[PDB]
Amino acid sequence: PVNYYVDTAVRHVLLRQGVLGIKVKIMLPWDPTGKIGPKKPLPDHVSIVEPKDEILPTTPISEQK
Amino acid sequence: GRVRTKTVKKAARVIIEKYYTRLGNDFHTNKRVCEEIAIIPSKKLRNKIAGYVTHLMKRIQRGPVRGISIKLQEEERERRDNYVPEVSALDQEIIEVDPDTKEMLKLLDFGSLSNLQVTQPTVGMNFKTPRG
Amino acid sequence: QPIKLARVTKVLGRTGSQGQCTQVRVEFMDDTSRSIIRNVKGPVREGDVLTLLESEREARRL
Amino acid sequence: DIKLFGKWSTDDVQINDISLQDYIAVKEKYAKYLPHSAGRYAAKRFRKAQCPIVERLTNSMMMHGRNNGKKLMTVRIVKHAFEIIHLLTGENPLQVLVNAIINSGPREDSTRIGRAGTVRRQAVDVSPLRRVNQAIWLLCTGAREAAFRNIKTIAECLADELINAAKGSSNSYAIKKKDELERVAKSNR
RNA sequence: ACGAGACUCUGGCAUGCUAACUAGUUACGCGACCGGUCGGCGUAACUUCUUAGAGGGACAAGUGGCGUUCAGCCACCCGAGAUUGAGCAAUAACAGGUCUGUGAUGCCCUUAGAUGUCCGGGGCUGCACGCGCGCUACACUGACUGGCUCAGCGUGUGCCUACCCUACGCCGGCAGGCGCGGGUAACCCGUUGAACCCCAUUCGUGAUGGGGAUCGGGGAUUGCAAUUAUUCCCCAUGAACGAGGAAUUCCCAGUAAGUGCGGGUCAUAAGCUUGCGUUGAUUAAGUCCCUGCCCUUUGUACACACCGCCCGU
Ligand SMILES: [Mg+2]
Ligand SMILES: [Mg+2]
């Protein structure tokens, strides 16, 4: 995931006394289709669909259509 | 080492607590259920979660589990806990009573009780564990 | 003294400077009622037979 | 009808040691035409007890660097010296090998002191598997250094080594080493 | 929450799916030899074999024990597989290495009889000696000589840039040389006819036909030059070495070790390294004994932290 969730850059800065090295790492947010970040979720992230609230039928009802 | 990580265990616990009705003792049906109701980005992780779900289903089959808490299961559990004997264990024809508690009851004004049977007191005053 | 066999009834543990000996419980093939602890040098498992040339020492517990 | 090579039966081989009966595999499920079966007996502990004893000898023959992995040469060296044991003794070579294995395995030997120690040695008993392993190793070593720098070919040194070990003679390197180990264990009792 | 795991690549399974004249296999024709053998020719079937996509498949899932009957561990069945191997890898630190990789660099130094840059010639190898990694051995479980028969990973004609991999024919013991073609590559080398190993032969226990250091005389190749001998070939010569003291290294399965082969380096070139197959084990399923390294409690007068601190003549 480090190859598509974090974007890295390394640069040099020429100053009077010498070179300063700067490293910038950005961890992209999960973006479903829209390019702000990766489309794939993190492999260890498990999302469980919330079950919808059903009502148990008390008596057998037959619906004719 | 086949020790499951917390990812697998928490995922399995949540899946069981949410979809206990759809699950059973079959690994190959449980894994399909998991892949239908959840979003697991890996097949190996899905298989591990389904295996632990099967293990936990077997565990709940013979009692309770400290991690799971199923709302419908608690009603049946307290229904089992609603056992009531035919005759109350506190309803005794004769209950033994020491002379001291008999005197206390007499001072309470309840000295007319009939079920009391005044048993003999102890003889030796040896109720302490020897020191050493 | 004669040479006599003994069947292993349970593996007690590992002993030695480098854990090279298995300390084990053995019951005698003929008597079948007297048992001792001995250290055996090599891979040992349930039910195999050790021939004891000496047969009355006892290995030290633990 | 699964004679080794194509000539040596197994139905008549009697281990008659009780202790090593479960660790010498020669008789019915372990009757094979050749002492070469690839096999995965090193994968799990104790499985090598399911390996036929002739294949264990064959594997132990590939030793001292220049002969590593040359298993066809070693199966040839066993086929010969079985042909030679039969000529010298008149008995089944498998029986001679089994008797040699029984006779050449130490029963006691010494380890470093008991629970702990760094001065002397303490006598202990030998596992049956370690007995068979040590017997094979000693027989192979005796043959190997009998054939070294000598016109006597291998498959002659090994045959005579196995014959002497079956006889219990002290002309055998394996018997000498077994006696030496057993005596040292006796002294450190 | 980071790290571990998960993850990606990779190894094993699929007669199930997708589909192939730059892969094949069956079948059928036509031929060559004695129904059989045809890497002989040709074209239907098709996809087992070959490629490579999608999906499937294993979860300690089943059974029996051990466990707080939990987390898990052991054994067994079924199964292609019941622990394949790598890649990536936290906080924090080292005065670790690199200014000799850079049009990365701050300060110094030098800058025209230059520390810039070409161009000759030396050196980098020089040899009383000490120390590492290694190669070849000390043979018969072997050398020699014929015969037989099996791989895999892959690399091939270049910006500058000269320099590619080679079949086939001929000439020459040989190393080579000369003509002719294919290939920018599942198309040609190539069906990669590897070595060990296998089969037979001669030797016959000794420095021997083991072993090949050293050295002489010839012959070629690449290069602008081969001497201090680039490399290769031939014929001669034929040293130590008979298994190695104290002391040490690396290793748990297609593994160690034998054995060749490719890539890099490369005008010329592997005793190196990085990969690949091939033959294929002994032993172990454990422990803190040695060596480390972690903790935990404990002591400190240390905190630049024991390479500390500190006392007296
Ligand atoms: Mg230690
Ligand atoms: Mg201080």
Swiss-Prot record, chain A:
Cross-link (Glycyl lysine isopeptide (Lys-Gly) (interchain with G-Cter in ubiquitin)): K40, K52
Localization annotation: Cytoplasm; Nucleus; Nucleus, Nucleolus; Mitochondrion inner membrane
Source organism superkingdom: Eukaryota
Positions of post-translational Phosphothreonine modification: T58, T59
One of the GO biological process terms: positive regulation of activated T cell proliferation
Keywords of the record: Acetylation, Apoptosis, Cell cycle, Cell division, Cytoplasm, Cytoskeleton, DNA damage, DNA repair, DNA-binding, Isopeptide bond, Lyase, Membrane, Methylation, Mitochondrion, Mitochondrion inner membrane, Mitosis, Nucleus, Phosphoprotein, Ribonucleoprotein, Ribosomal protein, RNA-binding, Transcription, Transcription regulation, Translation regulation, Ubl conjugation
Residues joined by cross-link Glycyl lysine isopeptide (Lys-Gly) (interchain with G-Cter in SUMO2): K52
GO molecular function: class I DNA-(apurinic or apyrimidinic site) endonuclease activity; damaged DNA binding; DNA binding; DNA endonuclease activity; DNA-(apurinic or apyrimidinic site) endonuclease activity; DNA-binding transcription factor binding; enzyme binding; Hsp70 protein binding
CC terms in the record's Gene Ontology section: cytoplasm; cytosol; cytosolic ribosome; cytosolic small ribosomal subunit; endoplasmic reticulum; extracellular exosome; focal adhesion; membrane
Keyword Ribosomal protein assigned: yes
Residue list for modification Phosphoserine: S47, S62
Family: Belongs to the universal ribosomal protein uS3 family.
Full protein name: Small ribosomal subunit protein uS3
Full protein stretch here: 163 to 227 of 243
Curated annotation (Swiss-Prot), chain B:
Residues modified as Phosphoserine: S112
Post-translational modification: Ubiquitinated at Lys-102 by RNF14 and RNF25 in response to ribosome collisions (ribosome stalling).
Modified residues (N6-succinyllysine): K18
Subunit organization: Component of the small ribosomal subunit. Part of the small subunit (SSU) processome, composed of more than 70 proteins and the RNA chaperone small nucleolar RNA (snoRNA) U3.
Annotated disease: Diamond-Blackfan anemia 4: A form of Diamond-Blackfan anemia, a congenital non-regenerative hypoplastic anemia that usually presents early in infancy. Diamond-Blackfan anemia is characterized by a moderate to severe macrocytic anemia, erythroblastopenia, and an increased risk of developing leukemia. 30 to 40% of Diamond-Blackfan anemia patients present with short stature and congenital anomalies, the most frequent being craniofacial (Pierre-Robin syndrome and cleft palate), thumb and urogenital anomalies.
Family: Belongs to the eukaryotic ribosomal protein eS17 family.
Protein name: Small ribosomal subunit protein eS17
Swiss-Prot record, chain C:
Residues that bear Phosphoserine: S35
PROSITE patterns: RIBOSOMAL_S28E
Keyword match Transcription: no
UniProt cross-references to Pfam families, sorted A to Z: Ribosomal_S28e
GO molecular function list: RNA binding; structural constituent of ribosome
UniProt GO cellular component terms: cytoplasm; cytoplasmic side of rough endoplasmic reticulum membrane; cytosol; cytosolic small ribosomal subunit; extracellular exosome; nucleolus; nucleoplasm; ribosome
GO biological process: cytoplasmic translation; maturation of SSU-rRNA; ribosomal small subunit assembly; ribosomal small subunit biogenesis; ribosome biogenesis; rRNA processing; translation
Gene3D superfamilies: Nucleic acid-binding proteins
Protein family: Belongs to the eukaryotic ribosomal protein eS28 family.
Disease named in the record: Diamond-Blackfan anemia 15, with mandibulofacial dysostosis: A form of Diamond-Blackfan anemia, a congenital non-regenerative hypoplastic anemia that usually presents early in infancy. Diamond-Blackfan anemia is characterized by a moderate to severe macrocytic anemia, erythroblastopenia, and an increased risk of malignancy. 30 to 40% of Diamond-Blackfan anemia patients present with short stature and congenital anomalies, the most frequent being craniofacial (Pierre-Robin syndrome and cleft palate), thumb and urogenital anomalies.
Subunit structure: Component of the 40S small ribosomal subunit. Part of the small subunit (SSU) processome, composed of more than 70 proteins and the RNA chaperone small nucleolar RNA (snoRNA) U3.
Protein name, as recorded: Small ribosomal subunit protein eS28
Curated annotation (Swiss-Prot), chain D:
Cell compartments where the protein resides: Cytoplasm; Nucleus, Nucleolus
Keyword Acetylation included in the entry's annotation: yes
Cross-link (Glycyl lysine isopeptide (Lys-Gly) (interchain with G-Cter in SUMO2)): K32
Phylogenetic placement of the source organism: Eukaryota, Metazoa, Chordata, Craniata, Vertebrata
Record keywords, A-Z: Acetylation, Cytoplasm, Isopeptide bond, Nucleus, Phosphoprotein, Ribonucleoprotein, Ribosomal protein, Ubl conjugation
Keyword tRNA processing appears in the UniProt entry: no
A Pfam match: Ribosomal_S7
Residues that bear N6-acetyllysine: K32
Gene Ontology process terms (BP): cytoplasmic translation; regulation of translational fidelity; ribosomal small subunit assembly; ribosomal small subunit biogenesis; translation; translational initiation
Function description: Component of the small ribosomal subunit. The ribosome is a large ribonucleoprotein complex responsible for the synthesis of proteins in the cell. Part of the small subunit (SSU) processome, first precursor of the small eukaryotic ribosomal subunit. During the assembly of the SSU processome in the nucleolus, many ribosome biogenesis factors, an RNA chaperone and ribosomal proteins associate with the nascent pre-rRNA and work in concert to generate RNA folding, modifications, rearrangements and cleavage as well as targeted degradation of pre-ribosomal RNA by the RNA exosome.
Residues annotated with Phosphoserine modification: S127
Species of origin: Homo sapiens (Human)
Entry protein name: Small ribosomal subunit protein uS7
